[PDB]
Enzyme design. Sequence first.
Site, PDB file in Angstrom:
ATOM      1  N   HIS B 291       0.803  -1.210   0.000  1.00  0.00           N
ATOM      2  CA  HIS B 291       0.000   0.000   0.000  1.00  0.00           C
ATOM      3  C   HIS B 291       0.841   1.267   0.000  1.00  0.00           C
ATOM      4  CE1 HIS B 291      -2.268  -3.282   2.094  1.00  0.00           C
ATOM      5  NE2 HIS B 291      -3.073  -3.017   1.080  1.00  0.00           N
TER       6      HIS B 291
HETATM    7  S1  FES Z   1       1.668  -0.634   3.132  1.00  0.00           S
HETATM    8 FE1  FES Z   1      -0.025  -1.812   3.911  1.00  0.00          FE
HETATM    9  S2  FES Z   1       0.907  -3.676   4.626  1.00  0.00           S
HETATM   10 FE2  FES Z   1       2.605  -2.364   4.122  1.00  0.00          FE
END
Ligand code: FES
Lengths: 95, 326, 241, 354, 354
Positions: B291
Amino acid sequence: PNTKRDIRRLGSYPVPPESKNFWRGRFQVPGGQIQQGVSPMQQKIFFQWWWNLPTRYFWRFTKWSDFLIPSLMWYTGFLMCKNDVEEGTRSRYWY
Amino acid sequence: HRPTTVKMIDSWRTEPSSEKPMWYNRFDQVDHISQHPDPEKTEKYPPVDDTRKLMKTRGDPHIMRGWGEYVYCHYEHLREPVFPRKPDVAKGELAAGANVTRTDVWKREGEPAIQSIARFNPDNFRPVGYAENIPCPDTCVPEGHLDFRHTRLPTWHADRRPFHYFATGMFGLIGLAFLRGTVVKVVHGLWPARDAIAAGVIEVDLRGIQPGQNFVVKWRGKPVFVRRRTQAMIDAATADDAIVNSLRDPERDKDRVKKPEWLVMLGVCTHLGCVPYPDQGLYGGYFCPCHGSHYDHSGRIRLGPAPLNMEIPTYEFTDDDTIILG
Amino acid sequence: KDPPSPPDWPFWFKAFSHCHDIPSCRRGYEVYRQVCATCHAARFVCFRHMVNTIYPENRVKQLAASFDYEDGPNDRGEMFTRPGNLLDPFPSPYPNEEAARFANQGASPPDLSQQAAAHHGGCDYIMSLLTGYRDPPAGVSLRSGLYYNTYFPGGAISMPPPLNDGAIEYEDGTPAVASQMAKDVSQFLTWAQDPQHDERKLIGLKMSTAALVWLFSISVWNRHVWTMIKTRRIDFTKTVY
Amino acid sequence: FILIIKDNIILYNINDSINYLWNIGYIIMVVMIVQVITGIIINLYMNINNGYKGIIYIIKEIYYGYILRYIHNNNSTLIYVVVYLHIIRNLYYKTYYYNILIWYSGMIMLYQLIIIGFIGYILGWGQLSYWGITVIINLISGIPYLILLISGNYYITIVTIKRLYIVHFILPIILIYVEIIHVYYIHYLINNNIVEYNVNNKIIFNNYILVKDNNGIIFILNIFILELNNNIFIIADNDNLIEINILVTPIHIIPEWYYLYWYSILKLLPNKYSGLYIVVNSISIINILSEYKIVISEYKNYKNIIWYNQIIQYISMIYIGIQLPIIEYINYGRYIIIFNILLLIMYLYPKKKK
Amino acid sequence: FILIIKDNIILYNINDSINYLWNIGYIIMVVMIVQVITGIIINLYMNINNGYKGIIYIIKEIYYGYILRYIHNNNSTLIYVVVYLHIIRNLYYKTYYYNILIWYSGMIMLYQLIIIGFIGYILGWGQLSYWGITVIINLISGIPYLILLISGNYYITIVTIKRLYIVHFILPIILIYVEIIHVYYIHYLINNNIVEYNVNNKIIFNNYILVKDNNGIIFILNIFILELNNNIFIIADNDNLIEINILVTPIHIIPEWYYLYWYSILKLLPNKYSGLYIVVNSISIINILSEYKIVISEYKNYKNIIWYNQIIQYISMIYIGIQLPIIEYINYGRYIIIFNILLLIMYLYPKKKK
Ligand code: FES
Ligand SMILES: CCCCCCCCCCCCCCCCCC(=O)OC[C@H](COP(=O)([O-])OCC(O)COP(=O)([O-])OC[C@@H](COC(=O)CCCCCCCCCCCCCCCCC)OC(=O)CCCCCCCCCCCCCCCCC)OC(=O)CCCCCCCCCCCCCCCCC
Ligand SMILES: CCCCCCCCCCCCCCCCCC(=O)OC[C@H](COP(=O)([O-])OCC(O)COP(=O)([O-])OC[C@@H](COC(=O)CCCCCCCCCCCCCCCCC)OC(=O)CCCCCCCCCCCCCCCCC)OC(=O)CCCCCCCCCCCCCCCCC
Ligand SMILES: CCCCCCCCCCCCCCCCCC(=O)OC[C@H](COP(=O)([O-])OCC[N+](C)(C)C)OC(=O)CCCCCCCCCCCCCCCCC
Ligand SMILES: COC1=C(OC)C(=O)C(C/C=C(\C)CC/C=C(/C)CC/C=C(\C)CC/C=C(\C)CC/C=C(\C)CC/C=C(/C)CC/C=C(\C)CCC=C(C)C)=C(C)C1=O
Ligand SMILES: COC1=C(OC)C(=O)C(C/C=C(\C)CC/C=C(\C)CC/C=C(\C)CC/C=C(\C)CC/C=C(\C)CC/C=C(\C)CC/C=C(\C)CCC=C(C)C)=C(C)C1=O
Ligand SMILES: COC1=C(OC)C(=O)C(C/C=C(\C)CC/C=C(\C)CC/C=C(\C)CC/C=C(\C)CC/C=C(\C)CC/C=C(\C)CC/C=C(\C)CCC=C(C)C)=C(C)C1=O
Ligand code: HEC
Ligand code: HEM
Ligand code: HEM
Ligand code: HEM
Ligand code: HEM
C-alpha cells in the site's frame, strides 16, 4: 447387612444419615461381654510383633506345606517338558 | 431381605436329609428343655498333653461321594417328600421337621396326643454328648496370650505423644514434598520444549557482511532484517534525529540501534503486515509495495498508510561480530 | 530356534547409582561418525542433544558444520544447501529406504536411534553382535554378501564386519581395537536412545531413598493405632484389671 | 456428598481379622487414578499421526516427559499384577459364594480392562503393535465386512489408530464408574472375613484400615519406584521399539506379559475359532463356580488343592506362551488345557451322598 | 437409580401456569448432549496436526461427515442462543431473588461454556482462529512468562492446539456434572412461577410438562434443520476458511457472534487492562443484583423498563462489534457502557423512604 434379628434396634432414636452402614452391621450380643483396652499412647506398640513372630511363621509354613506334593508334581512336569523339547529339537535338526 | 435364592429343589441324584442324614444320628430326647444337662456345670473330657492323644471325632470322613471338591458338612437345602421316612427315635435318631409332622413317630400308646406331640419339640433334642464336648469360653484371650496387662508401659515412662506426632508429621512432610515435586514437574512440561527453546535463538555472525547489505533471519516465525549501515545511511537517520516531533512516531535513531553500524529490526509493515523490501522508497530505506509505506534508514515510518515504526526486536551483542536474537 | 541370547556385559551404567561414562560416550560417537554413519542413520538424534552432555557447545558446532544439509525454499522457490547447525539431526547416508537397499544388496541398514533398546538383550545385543562375527559353522555355506554372526537371527547378516583394529584413531589416545570400539559405540548408542538416562536415575535415587523413610513413618503409625485393637481383652464370665 | 463420604469412609465398619490381602482392592483404586491422570497429561504432547515419533519426542524434548512415559507403561503392568492378585485372592477364599454381585461387578471391570490395555499397546505404533492387532483382528474375519468397518481400511493404518485412541481415552472413564457399583455392593453386601462365619469385631475404616492400607500401598510404591527408574524386571518387549514394516514380520509376535495366558490358548488349539471360544470359556466359566452347589457350606478353609493347581496352571500356560511354537510345547500345553477343564468341573459339580 | 429417576421425572411436581419460556432449560440439556456426542464422533476422523485439512477430509471423504461438521458448528450457535435466552428469561422474572443458588450454579456453567466455545473455535485452524487467539492471549502479557507456559512456544503452534484440544475434550464433561448440581437445586428450591406468590396448582412432569417441552424442542428442531442444511442465517464468518498466514493479518479479527459483546468492550476502552476488567464486571456484577435490597418484595411483574433497556444494550453492543473501529462508533459505544453501568446501579441500590 446382618440378619434381621441382629440389626433390630432397641432404641427409638432415628439412625443418623451418616451412620446407615454402621448400624446395618449391628449385632445382638447374647449374654453380655466385658471389653477392656488401653490407649496405645500408654503401651508398647512393637513388642507384640516380636512376641508373636515365631508362632506366626511356624503355623504359616505348616499350612503351606500342604502344597508340597502338588508343587513337586508340577515341577516334575516342568522338567520333563523342558528336556523333551531339547531332545525333539536335536532329533529333528541336529546331525 | 435382599434378592436371594436357596437351592430348595428335588435333585435327580442326591437324596434328601430325611432319607439319608449326613450328621451323627444319635440325639437324646427330654420332656422339657430344662431337663437337659448344663454344659457349664458338666465335666468335660480329661485334658491331654499330646496332640496325638486328643479324642476321636464322630464325623464320617466319607459321608459324601462322587466327582467334585471335597467337603464335610451336615446339612443341605433339598426338599423333602410329603411322606418322609419314619425316624427311629427309639434308637436316638432325630425327629424334626417333616419327619414329625408328616409321620406318626410322635404317637405314643395311651398318652394324650397333646402331651405326646409336646415332647417332639425341637428344643427337647440335643446331640448325645453336647454337655461334655461343646466349649464354654470364659474369655477371648486364653491364658498365656499377650494382652494390655503385659504391654502397658511402666508408670515412670516418658510421654509418647511427642514422638507419635513426629511420626505422623513425617508422613505428611514427605508426602507434601512428593506432591510439590509432582505438581511442579507436570507444569514444567508445558514450558517450551527443548527443541523449541533451541530454535528460538539465532546468532548473527556479523562476519562477512558488507556495509549497506541487508539480510533476513527467520526468528520466531517473523522476518528479522539485519542491515549493516553505511556512514551515509547513519548520517541520514541522524539528520532526521533533529526533525523528530515532525514524524508520525517520534523516535531517535540512538534509541533504535545499539550500534550505529547495525540496524536489527523486524521486517513487518505496521500497516497490514506485508514485508517491506530494502533499498526502496523515497528515503532509500524500506518500501512496502502493498500500500506504499516508506520507512527511513532507521526504520521509522515517513510516508504511506503505515501507522508506526518498524519494531526493534530483543537482541544483544555477544561480541563485536555476533548478535544473539532473544 | 530363537537367536542366541547375548551375555551380560559389565557396563558401568548398569548399577543403580551409576551414570553413563562420558569418556566412553565420546569415543562411541567417533566410531559412529567414522564407521557406522556410512550405512546407518540416526534420524532422531540431534546435535543439540550432545551439547553440554557429551561435548561442549563450540565443539558440537564444528561437528554439525562439517555436514551439508539441503534446506529451503529460498525466495526464488529453489532448494539450497547450507552447513549444519545444532538444530539439525544426524545426517542420513541415503535419501530413502529404496536407495539404502540398492546400495546394500537389498538389505536395509536400520536406523540406530533406538537400536540400543530394540533387541532382546538391549545394549548387550549391540556389543555381542559387533563381536559375534565367526567363520561359518561346518555344513553352512553363505551366499556372497552374507556373513556368519552367532547373535543375528538366522546366523547370516548382510552387514560386513564393520570393526577392524586401527580403523580410527581415538582423540584421547585410547588404543583402537575392535573390542574397544564395540564397547564404546554400544555405550554411545545406549545414551542416544535415552539421553535423559542420568537425570532419571539421579532423581530415582532421591525418590527411592525417601520412600524408605516414608515407609518407616507409616509403619510406626500403623503399629501405634492397631495396638488399641490387638491387645484388647474381651471377657464373658471373668474379670481381670 | 460430605455425608455420603462420612458414611462410607469415616463410619464404615470392617472386621479386624482381615489380612493384607484385603488391601489389594485399595491399591487398584489408587493406581487406576494415576494411570488416568498420567494418560491425560501424556496426551498434551502425544502425536497420534505417528505414535513412534511421539514417544521419542516425549522422552527427549519434554521436561520430565520420561517420567510420564515410563509411569504409564509400567503402571499398566502394576494394574494387571494387582488385579490378577485380587482375582487369585477372591478365588482362594471363595468370596464369590455369597457376594456374587460383587464378583459380577468386578468381572465387568476385568472385561473393560482387557480392551483398554490392548488398544493402548497398539498406540505405541511399533512392530509388535502393528502385527499384534493384525493377527488378532483376523480372528473375526469370519463375520463378513466386519474387519473393514473396524479397521477403516483394508490394512491397519492411522485411520485405525485414530478411532482406537478414542476408545482408549473414554473407556477407562467408564471403568471408574463401574468401580462405584463395585464399592456400592461391597458396602451393602458386607465383606468376607478370614473365618467362614460372621463375627462381632468390626472397627471403623478411617482410623485403622486406612492406615494399614497406606502402609501396604507405600510398600508397593517402594518396589514400583525401583522398577520405574531402573527396570529391574523386563516387563516391556524390546521389539516394539522397531519401526513398523508391513512386509516383514518381527522375530516373534506376542502381547504384553499380562495377555500371555490367552495368547497361548490360541497358539495351542488347532482351529482358530476353537481357540477364541476356549478364551471365552475361561473368563465366563469362573462366573458360575458355586451355582450348582446344594450343601450348606462355602467350601472355605479346606486345603484348597484345586485352587493351587489352577494358579500354577495359569503360570505354566503363561510360560508356554513365551516359547516358540515347538511341537513338544504344543502337546504339553494341550494337556494343561485338558487339566484345567477337569479342575473347573471339580469346582462346579455338587456331591452325592454315600 | 430407578427410584431417583422416578422422584425427579415421574413424580416431580411443577406449577401449571408456567409459559414456554420455562422450556428453555430442557432445550439446553438436550442440545448439550448432542454437542458432546457429535464431538466424540468427529474426533474419530479429525486430524489435530492440521485442523484445516481435517475439516476438508471430514466434509469430502467421510460418509455423512458433512452432517457431523455442520451440526457441531451450528449446534454451538444454538447452545449460546438458548443459553443467552435463558439468561434473559431469568433476568426478566428476577428468578435470582430467592433462587440464588440456582443462579450461582448456572453462572459456573456459563463461565465454563465461554472457555469451551472459544478453544473449539481455535481448533478450526483458520486465519481467524490463529489471529483471534494471538490477540486474546496478549491480554495476559503483563504476567511474566505466563504466555510462554500457555502457548508452549513463542508463537501459537500445533503445540498449543494439542493442549487446548484436551481442555475442549474434557471441560464439557465437567459442565455436564455441574448440570446435575443445577437440577438438584431446582428440584429442592422449587421453581418460580409467572405470578410472584406460591400457589397450589402443581402437576406431574412426565405426563404434562414433558409433552409440552417436547413440542417446544421439536419446534426449535424444525428451525435448526433449516439452518443446518441451507444456512439461512450467516452464523460462521467466512474468513476462517482461509489458510493461516502468520505474517499477514485478515481483513478483520473477530470471534463468533456469541462473543461479540465482550469483543466490543475491549475494542472500545482505551487501556487494554481496563477493557478486560469491564468484561469481568459485566458477568460478575449480575451475581449480586438483589443482595442490597431491604424491602419485602422481589420487584417482579412491574413494567420492567430497566430490563428492556439492558437487553437492547446487549444487542447494540453486539452491533458495534461488527463494525470497523471507526471513531464515531467508539464514542457511542462508550456512552452505551456508561449507560449500562447506570442501569446496573439502579438494580443494586435500595430505596429510601419518603
Ligand atoms: S503498506 Fe499496507 S501492509 Fe505495508
Ligand atoms: C457336529 C457337532 C454338532 C454339535 C451340536 C451341539 C448342540 C448342543 C445344543 C445345546 C443347547 C444348550 C444347552 C444348555 C443347557 C442349559 C441348562 C442349564 O443352564 O441348566 C441349569 C439348571 C439349574 O438347575 P437348578 O435346579 O438351579 O440346580 C440344580 C442343582 O445344581 C443340582 O441338580 P441335581 O442334583 O438334580 O443334578 C442334576 C444333574 C443333571 O446333569 C445332567 O444331566 C448333565 C450331564 C452332562 C454330561 C456331559 C458329559 C459330556 C461327556 C462327553 C464325552 C465325549 C466322549 C467322546 C468319545 C470319543 C470316542 C472316539 O446335574 C448335575 O449333576 C450337575 C450339573 C453340572 C453342570 C455344569 C455345567 C457346565 C457347562 C459347560 C461345560 C463345558 C465347558 C468346559 C469345556 C469346554 C471345552 C471342551 O441345571 C440343571 O438343572 C442341571 C443341568 C445341567 C446341564 C449340563 C449339560 C452339560 C453338557 C455338556 C456337553 C458336552 C459335549 C461334549 C461332546 C464331546 C464329543 C466328543
Ligand atoms: C490419587 C493417587 C495419587 C496421585 C498422585 C499424583 C500422580 C501424578 C502422576 C505422576 C506425574 C509424574 C511426576 C511424578 C514425580 C514423582 C517424584 C517427585 O515428585 O519427586 C520430587 C522430589 C525429587 O527431588 P527434586 O524435586 O529434584 O528436588 C528438589 C530440591 O530438593 C528442592 O527444590 P528446589 O531446589 O527447586 O528449591 C529449593 C529452595 C526452594 O526455596 C523456597 O521455596 C524457599 C523460599 C520460601 C519463602 C517463603 C516465604 C513465606 C512468607 C512470605 C511473606 C509473608 C508476609 C505476610 C505479612 C502479612 C501482614 C498482614 O529451598 C532452598 O534453597 C532451601 C533454603 C531455603 C531458605 C529460606 C529462607 C527464608 C528467609 C526469609 C526471610 C524473610 C525476612 C523478611 C524481613 C523483612 C520484612 C519486611 O522428591 C524428593 O526430593 C523427595 C523428598 C522427600 C523428603 C526428604 C526429607 C526426609 C527427611 C527425613 C527426616 C527423618 C530423619 C531424622 C534424623 C534425625 C537424626 C537424629
Ligand atoms: C512413582 C510414582 C510417584 C511417587 C511419588 C509421588 C507421589 C505423590 C503422593 C502425594 C501424597 C500426598 C499426601 C499428603 C499427606 C499430608 C497429610 C498427612 O497425611 O499428614 C498426617 C496428618 C495426620 O496427623 P494426626 O491425625 O496425628 O494429627 C494430629 C493433629 N495434631 C498434631 C495437631 C494434634 O494429617 C494432617 O495433618 C491432616 C491432613 C489430612 C489430609 C486429608 C486429605 C488428603 C489430600 C491429599 C492432597 C492430594 C493433592 C493432589 C494434587 C495433584 C495435582 C497434580
Ligand atoms: C483369567 O484371568 C486370570 C489371569 O489372566 C489370564 C491370570 O494370570 C491368573 C493368575 C495370575 C498370576 C499367577 C500372576 C501373573 C502370573 C505370571 C505367571 C506372570 C509371571 C510369569 C512367570 C512366573 C512365568 C514363568 C513360569 C514358570 C517358570 C512355570 C513353569 C514351571 C513350573 C510350573 C514348575 C514349577 C512348579 C511349581 C508348582 C512352582 C513352585 C515350585 C516350587 C516352589 C518347588 C520347586 C521344586 C523343587 C524340587 C525345589 C488368574 C488367577 C486369572 O484368573
Ligand atoms: C495375536 O497375539 C495375541 C495378542 O497380542 C496381539 C493378545 O493380546 C491376545 C489377548 C487379547 C485380548 C484378550 C484382548 C484383545 C482386545 C481387543 C481386540 C480390543 C479391541 C477394541 C475394542 C473391543 C474397542 C471397542 C470398545 C468397546 C466394545 C467397549 C468395551 C467395553 C464394554 C463393551 C463393557 C461395557 C460397555 C461399555 C463400557 C461401552 C459404554 C457405551 C457407551 C457409554 C455408549 C453411550 C451411547 C449413547 C448414545 C448414550 C491374544 C489372544 C493373541 O493371540
Ligand atoms: C481478540 O478478539 C476477541 C475474541 O476473539 C478472538 C473473543 O473471543 C473475546 C471473548 C472471549 C472470551 C470471553 C473467552 C476467551 C476464552 C479463553 C481465552 C479460553 C482459554 C483456555 C482456557 C481458559 C483453558 C483452561 C481451562 C480451565 C482453566 C478450566 C475452565 C473452567 C473452570 C476454571 C471452571 C471450574 C474448573 C474446572 C471445570 C476445572 C476442573 C479441574 C479438574 C477436574 C482437575 C482435577 C485434578 C485433580 C488432581 C483431581 C474477546 C474479548 C476478544 O477481544
Ligand atoms: C559401526 C560399527 C556399525 C554398527 C554399530 C552397526 N553397523 Fe550395521 N548393518 C548393515 C546392514 C546392511 C544391516 C542390515 C541387517 C542385515 O544386514 O541383514 C545392518 C544392521 C545392523 C544392526 C541391526 C542388526 C539386526 O538385528 O538387523 C546393528 C545394531 C548394526 N548394523 C550396527 C550395514 C552396515 C555397514 C555397511 C557396510 C556398516 C559400515 C555397518 N553396518 C556398521 C555398523
Ligand atoms: C487402566 C487405564 C489405562 C491403561 C491400562 C493404559 C495402558 C496403556 C498402554 C500399555 C500404553 C502403551 C505403553 C507403551 O507405549 O508401550 C498406553 C499408551 C497411551 N495411553 Fe493409556 N492406558 C490407560 C488409560 C489411559 C487414559 C485415561 C488415557 C488418556 C486420557 C491414556 C492415554 C494414552 C496415550 C496418549 C498413550 C500413548 C502414549 C504411549 O505411547 O504410551 N491412557 N496406554
Ligand atoms: C478395576 C478392578 C477392581 C477394583 C477397583 C476392585 C476393588 C475392590 C475393593 C476396594 C474391594 C474391597 C476391599 C477388598 O476386598 O480388597 C474389592 C472387593 C472384591 N472384589 Fe474387587 N476390584 C476390582 C476387580 C475385581 C474383579 C475382576 C473381581 C472378580 C473376578 C473382583 C471381585 C471382588 C470380590 C469378590 C470382592 C469381595 C472381597 C471380600 O468379600 O472380601 N474385583 N474389590
Ligand atoms: C458445549 C460443548 C461444545 C461446544 C460449545 C463446542 C464448540 C466447538 C466449536 C465452535 C468448534 C469449531 C467450529 C468450526 O470448526 O468452525 C468445535 C470443534 C471441535 N470440537 Fe467442539 N464443542 C463442544 C464439545 C466438544 C466435545 C465434547 C468434543 C469431543 C469429545 C469436541 C470436539 C471437537 C473437535 C474434534 C473439533 C474440531 C472439528 C472442527 O473443526 O469443528 N467438542 N467445537
Ligand atoms: C449449561 C447451561 C444451563 C442449563 C443446562 C440450564 C438448565 C436449567 C433448567 C432445566 C432449568 C429448570 C427449568 C427451567 O426453568 O427452564 C433451569 C432453571 C434455572 N436456571 Fe438454568 N441452565 C443453564 C444455564 C443457566 C445460567 C447461566 C443461569 C444464570 C445466569 C441459569 C439460571 C437459572 C435459574 C435462575 C433457574 C430458575 C428458573 C426458575 O426459577 O423458574 N441457568 N436451568
